[PDB]
Design a protein around this ligand. Sequence first.
Ligand SMILES: C/C(=C\[C@H](C)CCCCC(=O)O)[C@@H]1O[C@@H]2C=C[C@@H]1OC(=O)\C=C/C=C\C=C\[C@H]1O[C@@H]3C[C@H]1O[C@@H](/C=C/C[C@H]1O[C@H](C[C@H](O)[C@H]1C)[C@@H](O)[C@@H](O)/C=C/CC/C=C/C2)[C@@H]3C
Lengths: 225, 158, 1114, 105, 95, 249, 31
Amino acid sequence: SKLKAPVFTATTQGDHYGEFVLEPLERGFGVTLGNPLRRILLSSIPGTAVTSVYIEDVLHEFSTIPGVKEDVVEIILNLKELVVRFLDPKMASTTLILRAEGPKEVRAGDFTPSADVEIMNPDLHIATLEEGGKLYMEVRVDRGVGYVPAERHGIKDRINAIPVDAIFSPVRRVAFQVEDTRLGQRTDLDKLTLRIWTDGSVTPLEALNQAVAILKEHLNYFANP
Amino acid sequence: VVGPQLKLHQCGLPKRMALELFKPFLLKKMEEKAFAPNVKAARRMLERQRDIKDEVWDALEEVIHGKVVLLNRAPTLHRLGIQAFQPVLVEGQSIQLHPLVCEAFNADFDGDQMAVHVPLSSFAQAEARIQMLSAHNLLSPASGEPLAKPSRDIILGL
Amino acid sequence: MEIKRFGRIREVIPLPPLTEIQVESYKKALQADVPPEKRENVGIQAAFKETFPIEEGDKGKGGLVLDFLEYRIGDPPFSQDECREKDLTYQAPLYARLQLIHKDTGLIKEDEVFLGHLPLMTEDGSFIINGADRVIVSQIHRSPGVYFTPDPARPGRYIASIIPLPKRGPWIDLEVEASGVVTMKVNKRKFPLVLLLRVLGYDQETLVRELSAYGDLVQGLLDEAVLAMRPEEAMVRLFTLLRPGDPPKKDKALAYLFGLLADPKRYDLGEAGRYKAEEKLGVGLSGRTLVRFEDGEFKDEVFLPTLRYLFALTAGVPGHEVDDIDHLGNRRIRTVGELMADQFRVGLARLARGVRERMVMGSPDTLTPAKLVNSRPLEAALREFFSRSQLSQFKDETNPLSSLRHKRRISALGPGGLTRERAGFDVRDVHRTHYGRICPVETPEGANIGLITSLAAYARVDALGFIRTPYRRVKNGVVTEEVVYMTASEEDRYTIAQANTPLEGDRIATDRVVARRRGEPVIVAPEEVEFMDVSPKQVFSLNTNLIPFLEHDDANRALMGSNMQTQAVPLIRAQAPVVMTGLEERVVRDSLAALYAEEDGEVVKVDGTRIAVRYEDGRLVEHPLRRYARSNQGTAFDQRPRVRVGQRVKKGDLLADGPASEEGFLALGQNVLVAIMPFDGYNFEDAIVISEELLKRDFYTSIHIERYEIEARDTKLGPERITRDIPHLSEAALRDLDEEGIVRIGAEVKPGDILVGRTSFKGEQEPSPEERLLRSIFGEKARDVKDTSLRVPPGEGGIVVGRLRLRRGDPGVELKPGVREVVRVFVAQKRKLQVGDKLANRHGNKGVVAKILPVEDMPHLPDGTPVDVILNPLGVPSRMNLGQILETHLGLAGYFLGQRYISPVFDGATEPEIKELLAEAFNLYFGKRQGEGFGVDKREKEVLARAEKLGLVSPGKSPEEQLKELFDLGKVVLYDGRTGEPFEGPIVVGQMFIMKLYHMVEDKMHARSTGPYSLITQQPLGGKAQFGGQRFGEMEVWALEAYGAAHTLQEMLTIKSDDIEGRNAAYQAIIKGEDVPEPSVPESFRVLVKELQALALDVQTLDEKDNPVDIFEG
Amino acid sequence: TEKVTQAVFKNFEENYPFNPLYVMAQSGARGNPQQIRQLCGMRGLMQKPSGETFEVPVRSSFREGLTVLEYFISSHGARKGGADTALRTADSGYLTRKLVDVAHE
Amino acid sequence: MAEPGIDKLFGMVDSKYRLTVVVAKRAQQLLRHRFKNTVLEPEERPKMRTLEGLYDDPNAVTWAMKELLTGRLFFGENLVPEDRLQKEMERLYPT
Amino acid sequence: TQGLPRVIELFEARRPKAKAVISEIDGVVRIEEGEDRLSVFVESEGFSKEYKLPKDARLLVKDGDYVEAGQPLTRGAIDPHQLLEAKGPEAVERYLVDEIQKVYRAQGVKLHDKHIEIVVRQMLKYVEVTDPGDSRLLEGQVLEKWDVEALNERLIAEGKVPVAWKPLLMGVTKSALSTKSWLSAASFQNTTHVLTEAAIAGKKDELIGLKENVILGRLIPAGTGSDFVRFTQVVDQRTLKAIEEARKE
Amino acid sequence: SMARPVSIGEAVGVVAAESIGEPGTQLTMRT
Ligand SMILES: C/C(=C\[C@H](C)CCCCC(=O)O)[C@@H]1O[C@@H]2C=C[C@@H]1OC(=O)\C=C/C=C\C=C\[C@H]1O[C@@H]3C[C@H]1O[C@@H](/C=C/C[C@H]1O[C@H](C[C@H](O)[C@H]1C)[C@@H](O)[C@@H](O)/C=C/CC/C=C/C2)[C@@H]3C
């Protein structure tokens, strides 16, 4: 049978991205763990994302917001680049709010002061209004798993709001690759490197741990009832 | 044999042939690294018919670290008919060749062979790794064009 | 597996006996089963007649004649095997019933004589010579006749060639110079033709009468008024001119040679010389370039009338054309029989001079045959052939086909009558004519391209060395059953219809009949057609005929797969390919590597050793299986029984299989589950990816057998002796040696292991005392004998499978002077596919296994089955071997449909048929998946989707209905082993027959650090313990000069070769972790300087201050 | 033929831009238009050993079975190439050597 | 993974071969004194991965190139005579 | 002719088949007579030079055309020796390079001209003496080593004879053949001639080229074995100041 | 072929010979 328990190095940046290198794995096991984790990693980690927007004055994503230097589209996208942490562990829905000045440029940390909900990336360039500029926003945030386009859910908070594509998944990129390493005479033993990029929110390492737990959990369903 | 795995500056080298190619160097290393009281006794345990002890592979490996070899195919027609590489300790008995280096060697994986050589003196190493390392000779000396271009399969993917 | 047969054209004639060339040639040169009264010329029979009313010195004064009456072929003194064991040539003594007469009369027929030993051909077609099976390849030369030709050194002019049968006359060329003069060139001597013409009695005025007013050409041939003379005097002058020295009037003597009689110019008894010299030239002939004893003066018969056509081509009315030297109506075939017989000529030729020599030395009263004949000029002339002629190859024994194909080879090189390896390009090209006779495909890729070739399946060499192809006479509408083999020339006058052509019942069916005539492809009216191709198989070689979809393979890659099959080593689980062509059973049959019944009887006994059958009444024979014997190329010929105890045998059917044979059919490899897709760079360029699965299933694995040999010779120092008593050797090193010195059988032998112990004497010094004093005091008995045993060389090793011993003395055994006893050790070795090995397919898709994957990887069908080998598509388009693609498709049918296939060449499967079978297959394959409880999982649906975006499936069809769509186009939804996720977009998958070739990484791959330096050249060369040492060629010297690599080049030039001082300093430094060099002075330099001094010449070496240096200090 | 050849190439373009044979030929990958022609379209006008062209063309294309006479007519070429390469591979580094003996210094 | 920092190394010198010659000539001394000769010491020294922790890379030339790359060594084309060059060389723990 | 045979024809300065005539003189063209006999005159004021053609010849100057010193009359290839004398050494160099490339180009190959140039110049390395100053009047001499006399005896030690010479198109082989250093010269077709000669004269090598030093096993005079680089020493911070404190002793 | 000016000591002669030489193959010999 043979081959000792491998060593698991982790090297991290501290919010987004960390490398994970469990070393001598027998020929094959590299992928055998690597890929399923990636699947789980990109697919089934719980997060939160903007899911619907209401803009005071104007329906349609394809409209004209006046006084706004940008336009609805860049906002929707801008919004998708926003991350918010739900401190309140029971809640599964929140609405955010915005009130906009004249000559000013709105950051994401210019939202509704609201406690209980934690804006993770206070910067972020949301919008920008001109002299005599008016923007009010009602942005819905939702708990979730993958990437869920609007054309699926169709969240309608109002009868005027436009619904956005949901990227509720703190992992933004998973890239893994198994190369060969050597123990003694054996030069072709698996060495799997896991590279996890998450939005500063859930750490890569946490991501990984969660991901493992999901697969293990699931693997216990293969218990005869 | 094709070695897609390697980086541009790396090599085949079956363990057997590395070991031997490099033998004398290993003998001094074996001594340097304990097991092997003298270099003459290092010679000895490398002979006992077959079956090689892990420590020695580990030694060999250290021996090699950053030395390069010369590979060479068939009709050596221009300088790129020799290229330097860092040897990788590899399974099996075929030498493994980076796919990007093929063109210059006009190597084709249907029965080609290549010889390999070990530059001994530090000069000759230096010589190989500065001047003849596969990865410092990226462009044709005949028409200053890239010779290490993506190709026959890499293109397809891209 | 049930077999499905393909295509129409019902094969009117089966392939002829194949080794026919060889086997039937000999027969008719050795009428050994025909009474010595009949024996109508040719062969040995004629070669005697050609020599044997042999006179002695003087013309009708001194007695003694000695006349051949009949020869007798002896009987083999050693069985076909003893020979191969004792190291002898399978022979039979040859006897001549000769008869010597006198002037006082006395008809003495000395009861035959032994003139020498005649090597006998086997059933095979092959010979046995000093052990070892040799094959005599049939050569080709110019079919004798008269030719002309253009003149390469003078444009708008011509030469004239009078070329007789080989070793039956001299080469006479006629050519006109810028002088006008016509000049005869014979035996590389050149005189004015006129001189001869004068001899043959032409007169200044007869010539102009005959040879004037076309061209002012005669005017040159004339002017030699000086020798437009007395035909007798002409003769004298011409004899002085041909043999400088002896000046008498018996010039009739030599001039009779290049004239009349069957001594020399016998351009035929009355065949392809006279015949073709008549049609081209001015008709009416006998058989010799001129006739002599008309009454005592020569009479011209070919010289002038040739000259006619020569002049009549230097201006000449139409009809007086040049000649196509490359036409097969101008190319003849010397088969074995004739070459062997031609060699008798050399033999008997010599034997005669040395009779006439002994007729002069001896008293005529007592001289007898036996006392005149020597028995050694026939031997040495005919030993020399079978042993030392280029035409006598070893015997390509890799697999049955390779051997079989050897015998049917044809080469324009060889002895004398043969072009060198530096001439002929017009020759090389596949000339029109080759059709049906020689192959447009088989030739070796470089150097001797076209200078060697394959005889075609249906071709037959004939009567006088012309290859003849079968045709079907079509009596103006109906295709008759009568088959007419006919010449390359006897073809240029007909309109022959192709076989691809349709038919109704027994007659042509279409209105626009395709056919050729002379050479041009021609469209022709049905009634306007005369003959018909018997098959397309006519056109190609045996091997070229084995490619199931040749029609679809570009002819270059076809030739690669035609050879390459000949490299295909036999396998333990060897298996006949999934998609065959027909000859695969027969190839194995005519090779006689497989054992077949003699006369429908009943098998009694069956074991790994023998098959013994009781043939209906006709006694009982035991057929011994050759078992793990070693082919010339180290391959392992071994028969396996294919028949059970107490079974009735089919007439002449497989009792046993050969080395590359599966139940009687050809098995050059394995058919195996393939997928044509890129892997991860692992099938880059030509590399193949393998599934380990194949090793677990011991598929591509084969048994190779080395052969080691050692001699013991006598020596000025004492005898080389084969002991097991080898000095100093630990009784553990000797462990595997029987009490003789020779390894046990079944012994497992690693490199450096005594295979055959042997002590030699050697006198390398004398031990001066003290050492002799020391020797006793501490025990070990000073020995007179060095070790020098056999031993396994680095790289090699395996199981000892047989020994062989031959002792000087022993009955039939004859080793060379000095050699006294010889030992032979045979060592087997199971092999197994390996990264570095090369697999090929029938369509020339060669390549090396570059990665074995464990089944966890490997693309796999949905049912779970993994593929076996992953072949890269990028390989296909550039070479245009599309047959491999089709083959994968039919194969994919097979897998599911459970059948193999016979698809003839240009007559096999069509897509219509192939896709019908793929249809039937998917219906069972998917019928299972449904009937088992499934259907079209998400993975296939995600593919099938983008599959229509790819216009590859019909939109508006069900995923099931869309799956079939694809399965029929021959592709399938593969699944990535590494990650269950499906390969996006369908992959063509199926069974492809793939061969393992002669080459393997095992035999290659060598690496040296140091060791054995030659004492002669002082550079590393050979290796008893450690091996090898690679050459640094002048090309590499350049590269290093091209790079700036000064020291690296200098390294390769000193310390790793001759430079004793240097290497030693270097290796003593590497051992001690020092930097290495500071090489004092290139040894090369010293050497040259001294090697110069030895020849006088100072060679001063000087520094920049121009004073001397002394690169030596000692 | 140039009509078939051009046609077989604008078919890929207009339907089948992701067809392998094409994709490969199009990209640097493998194949040139000369080869796609013989594969898909029509092989064309073969020349005889004495240079002169046959006035019957090879009407078929590997995909479709090309036919013994076509195969034979088109086998002359598939020898003239093999002989050509065996001459420019014969002499090892003939010219290079000449060029080095002058240049080297 | 081409030679580490070689673009910088080629630019340091006039004729590239000079580069080799320096690397060599340095990897020379750097060997003939057990590396008690480095200029780079602190935590600059190149190192090796193992079945074991980071050990001093044993490649002279590899060290030589890292060394050079720090401007801490000098190329005398003719500065300091060869007679005096082997003099003070065998001094700071040579044997 | 095409292909490699051409490239040799060229690199070896070889007077080809179908030399396709060039006019030796400037002047005006005049084609005369058809089928019977075909000749072409390029007659200027004064001289009337006549150039008889094969008759089959596909000439490429039509009647009346004005013509140039060495201009092709007929088509075909051009003799590089006829070109030398008619129109100098540069025009030669420029023909050779541009023709050699005419083939690599025509085929598929792309290489830089300089390579071919480097080689071509060597084909022009030597010149034969006409009326000397020191040596015998006929000898072939290296272009440079004649300047070692021409611009030597017309400066410091000025006078005698400037040594007149002639341009000498050497084929690649011939030029390789006449190569000063005997060591190199030895490796060619007749080693004896070389040594015999070079022994009589106290001949010395000097070993400039490479073919030389590889023969001896010496370190090639190039790359790292280039005099311009191999003397380069590396001194090391503390080694330099400590070497400075034993210099003033 | 590093697209800079030459280094002193480039063995340019041989480099040329090789450059002109290596293609010597893929030229057709029919003349
Ligand atoms: C080149 C040559 C013979 C070579 C040794 C073999 C041919 C090489 C071509 C090739 O394989 O590509 C010539 O051959 C003959 C006459 C003069 C020439 O002599 C020659 O130029 C040179 C040698 C001629 C005869 C040598 C005879 C002896 O030399 C050794 C022991 C004797 O037999 C030789 C065995 C040759 C058999 C070969 O068989 C081939 C494969 C290998 O090349 C060999 C196994 C098979 O593919 C087989 O089908 C090919 C047969 C070639 C038929 C040619 C016949 C004419 C072996 C190499």
